[PDB]
Write an enzyme that holds these catalytic residues in place. Structure first.
Site, PDB file in Angstrom:
ATOM      1  N   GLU A  86     -71.092  36.005  91.573  1.00  0.00           N
ATOM      2  CA  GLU A  86     -71.596  35.172  90.957  1.00  0.00           C
ATOM      3  C   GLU A  86     -72.756  34.593  91.862  1.00  0.00           C
ATOM      4  O   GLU A  86     -73.871  33.898  90.677  1.00  0.00           O
ATOM      5  CB  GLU A  86     -70.681  34.487  90.892  1.00  0.00           C
ATOM      6  CG  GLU A  86     -69.223  34.357  90.452  1.00  0.00           C
ATOM      7  CD  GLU A  86     -68.060  33.138  90.238  1.00  0.00           C
ATOM      8  OE1 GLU A  86     -67.923  32.623  91.661  1.00  0.00           O
ATOM      9  OE2 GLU A  86     -67.789  32.821  89.155  1.00  0.00           O
ATOM     10  N   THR A 133     -66.174  27.907  91.965  1.00  0.00           N
ATOM     11  CA  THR A 133     -67.214  28.169  90.811  1.00  0.00           C
ATOM     12  C   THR A 133     -65.667  28.187  89.283  1.00  0.00           C
ATOM     13  O   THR A 133     -66.714  28.828  88.670  1.00  0.00           O
ATOM     14  CB  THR A 133     -67.707  29.342  91.284  1.00  0.00           C
ATOM     15  OG1 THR A 133     -66.186  30.100  90.915  1.00  0.00           O
ATOM     16  CG2 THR A 133     -68.453  29.800  92.503  1.00  0.00           C
ATOM     17  N   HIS A 140     -57.353  33.838  84.161  1.00  0.00           N
ATOM     18  CA  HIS A 140     -58.809  33.444  84.704  1.00  0.00           C
ATOM     19  C   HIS A 140     -59.563  35.087  85.399  1.00  0.00           C
ATOM     20  O   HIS A 140     -60.465  35.081  85.618  1.00  0.00           O
ATOM     21  CB  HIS A 140     -59.239  32.341  85.222  1.00  0.00           C
ATOM     22  CG  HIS A 140     -59.063  31.312  84.419  1.00  0.00           C
ATOM     23  ND1 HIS A 140     -59.323  31.005  82.924  1.00  0.00           N
ATOM     24  CD2 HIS A 140     -57.720  31.061  84.800  1.00  0.00           C
ATOM     25  CE1 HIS A 140     -58.644  30.082  82.928  1.00  0.00           C
ATOM     26  NE2 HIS A 140     -57.799  29.223  83.274  1.00  0.00           N
ATOM     27  N   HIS A 162     -64.159  38.289  91.084  1.00  0.00           N
ATOM     28  CA  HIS A 162     -65.000  37.885  89.547  1.00  0.00           C
ATOM     29  C   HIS A 162     -66.247  39.343  89.442  1.00  0.00           C
ATOM     30  O   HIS A 162     -66.084  39.556  90.373  1.00  0.00           O
ATOM     31  CB  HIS A 162     -65.938  36.619  90.000  1.00  0.00           C
ATOM     32  CG  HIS A 162     -65.353  35.357  89.902  1.00  0.00           C
ATOM     33  ND1 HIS A 162     -64.925  34.678  89.475  1.00  0.00           N
ATOM     34  CD2 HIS A 162     -65.222  35.635  91.772  1.00  0.00           C
ATOM     35  CE1 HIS A 162     -64.607  33.423  89.732  1.00  0.00           C
ATOM     36  NE2 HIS A 162     -64.392  34.152  91.363  1.00  0.00           N
ATOM     37  N   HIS A 210     -59.516  36.687  95.380  1.00  0.00           N
ATOM     38  CA  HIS A 210     -59.485  37.500  93.561  1.00  0.00           C
ATOM     39  C   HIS A 210     -60.935  37.139  93.857  1.00  0.00           C
ATOM     40  O   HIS A 210     -61.759  37.444  95.105  1.00  0.00           O
ATOM     41  CB  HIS A 210     -59.561  35.689  93.131  1.00  0.00           C
ATOM     42  CG  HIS A 210     -59.812  34.641  93.453  1.00  0.00           C
ATOM     43  ND1 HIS A 210     -60.162  33.388  93.958  1.00  0.00           N
ATOM     44  CD2 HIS A 210     -61.509  34.274  92.461  1.00  0.00           C
ATOM     45  CE1 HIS A 210     -61.321  32.617  93.986  1.00  0.00           C
ATOM     46  NE2 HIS A 210     -62.036  33.193  93.281  1.00  0.00           N
ATOM     47  N   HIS A 227     -63.773  36.799  96.659  1.00  0.00           N
ATOM     48  CA  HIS A 227     -63.832  34.900  97.521  1.00  0.00           C
ATOM     49  C   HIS A 227     -62.185  35.189  98.085  1.00  0.00           C
ATOM     50  O   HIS A 227     -61.408  34.878  98.133  1.00  0.00           O
ATOM     51  CB  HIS A 227     -63.745  34.282  96.124  1.00  0.00           C
ATOM     52  CG  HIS A 227     -64.895  34.102  95.475  1.00  0.00           C
ATOM     53  ND1 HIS A 227     -65.287  33.524  94.129  1.00  0.00           N
ATOM     54  CD2 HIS A 227     -66.716  34.692  96.467  1.00  0.00           C
ATOM     55  CE1 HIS A 227     -66.645  33.428  93.948  1.00  0.00           C
ATOM     56  NE2 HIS A 227     -67.365  34.462  95.286  1.00  0.00           N
TER      57      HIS A 227
HETATM   58  N1  LIG Z   1     -58.787  26.638  93.128  1.00  0.00           N
HETATM   59  C1  LIG Z   1     -59.949  27.332  94.021  1.00  0.00           C
HETATM   60  C2  LIG Z   1     -60.078  28.362  94.729  1.00  0.00           C
HETATM   61  C3  LIG Z   1     -60.759  28.686  94.317  1.00  0.00           C
HETATM   62  C4  LIG Z   1     -62.396  29.112  93.719  1.00  0.00           C
HETATM   63  S1  LIG Z   1     -64.102  30.157  94.122  1.00  0.00           S
HETATM   64  N2  LIG Z   1     -64.196  30.933  92.788  1.00  0.00           N
HETATM   65  O1  LIG Z   1     -65.554  29.095  93.801  1.00  0.00           O
HETATM   66  O2  LIG Z   1     -63.615  30.857  95.065  1.00  0.00           O
HETATM   67  C5  LIG Z   1     -61.989  28.176  92.435  1.00  0.00           C
HETATM   68  C6  LIG Z   1     -60.991  27.595  92.562  1.00  0.00           C
HETATM   69 ZN   LIG Z   2     -63.760  32.492  93.128  1.00  0.00          ZN
END
Ligand SMILES: Nc1ccc(S(N)(=O)=O)cc1
Ligand SMILES: [Zn+2]
Ligand SMILES: OC[C@H]1O[C@@H](O)[C@H](O)[C@@H](O)[C@@H]1O
Ligand SMILES: OC[C@H]1O[C@@H](O)[C@H](O)[C@@H](O)[C@@H]1O
Ligand SMILES: OC[C@H]1O[C@H](O)[C@H](O)[C@@H](O)[C@@H]1O
Ligand SMILES: Nc1ccc(S(N)(=O)=O)cc1
Ligand SMILES: Nc1ccc(S(N)(=O)=O)cc1
Length: 258
Positions: A104, A196, A62, A94, A92, A117
């Site tokens: 996002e 998210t 993902h 997006h 990570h 993030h």
């Molecule tokens: N496990 C998880 C951690 C962080 C996010 S996020 N994209 O909201 O940072 C989504 C799932």
């Molecule tokens: Zn994220």
């Protein structure tokens, strides 16, 4: 039909397995900058990453996650809207198929090319898994990426991606300094929201920095060479792994800056 980002399993379908997708505290949101209000009750924000211990980078099908040792207070986030200490577990991104989309959160409906993030959990709950049972379990520091000059502190990430092209691959990723991913200013917006991605749990204090970082076109193009699929399977480029803005509902966005 495991969740993903295709036409058949993307954000518009997630509510079928994850009904909280239509909840009261979902993320991301559009940040209307004119309606966001300065909050003098916010304390100074402290991003303390000098002792961070990165360990590994993983293609999870993902996105890719850079994982940290969170067995003790090494990289932490405090202050601002936060009560207590939040420990960095992973970061990570997006991103889009094209520079004009990928973030996002949006800012006055503007989409950025990508969004970073940095994910942290509230140490009073002991572990990430217990933190995601709490309404103040997580704090995610979100940073927008625009395309311009290269970000030197991102290049080590870029250069390892060829070794984790497909879902389930990982590589050592020790001695990485996440300070190199920050902008100059820590001005931010904050609001209560959710993860998210599924399971979309409503546990997050979002802290979204106002200043984007600049990355080069070449850097983001290498994100787009990753694969959602596993080794041996038909290639599906890992692009457009972002959820669009969700309804703000009964929330207010606060600004750290006058
Ligand atoms: N496990 C998880 C951690 C962080 C996010 S996020 N994209 O909201 O940072 C989504 C799932
Ligand atoms: Zn994220
Ligand atoms: O190697 C990345 C970072 O790791 C941390 O543990 C060190 O204290 C920093 O000096 C270093 O920049
Ligand atoms: O009743 C007045 C209050 O309304 C709230 O919605 C705002 O968040 C506060 O900043 C304001 O002082
Ligand atoms: O800091 C993250 C990584 O950067 C580079 O890939 C280095 O060669 C590697 O040793 C390190 O783990
Ligand atoms: N049809 C369909 C059902 C559920 C999902 S999921 N796993 O994203 O909720 C996706 C598509
Ligand atoms: N301990 C731990 C660290 C990172 C992650 S990850 N791959 O979801 O970032 C999961 C567990």
């Amino acid at each position: 039909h495991h969740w993903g980002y295709g036409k058949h399993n993307g954000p518009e379908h997630w509510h079928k397995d994850f009904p909280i997708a239509k909840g009261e505290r979902q993320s991301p949101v559009d940040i209307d900058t004119h309606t966001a209000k300065y909050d003098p009750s916010l304390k100074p924000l402290s991003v303390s990453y000098d002792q961070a211990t990165s360990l590994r980078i993983l293609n999870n099908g993902h996105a890719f996650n850079v994982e940290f040792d969170d067995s003790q207070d090494k990289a932490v986030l405090k202050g601002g809207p936060l009560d207590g200490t939040y420990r960095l577990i992973q970061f990570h991104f997006h991103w889009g198929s094209l520079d004009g989309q990928g973030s996002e959160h949006t800012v006055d409906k503007k989409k950025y090319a990508a969004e970073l993030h940095l994910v942290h959990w509230n140490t009073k709950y002991g572990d990430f898994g217990k933190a995601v049972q709490q309404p103040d379990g997580l704090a995610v520091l979100g940073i927008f990426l625009k395309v311009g000059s290269a970000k030197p502190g991102l290049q080590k990430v870029v250069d390892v991606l060829d070794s984790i092209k497909t879902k389930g691959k990982s590589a050592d990723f020790t001695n990485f300094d996440p300070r190199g991913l920050l902008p100059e200013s820590l001005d931010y917006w904050t609001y209560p929201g959710s993860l998210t991605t599924p399971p979309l749990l409503e546990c997050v204090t979002w802290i979204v920095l106002k200043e984007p970082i600049s990355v080069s076109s070449e850097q983001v193009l290498k994100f787009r060479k990753l694969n959602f699929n596993g080794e041996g399977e038909p290639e599906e480029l890992m692009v457009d792994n972002w959820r669009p803005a969700q309804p703000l509902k009964n929330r207010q966005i606060k600004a750290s800056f006058k």
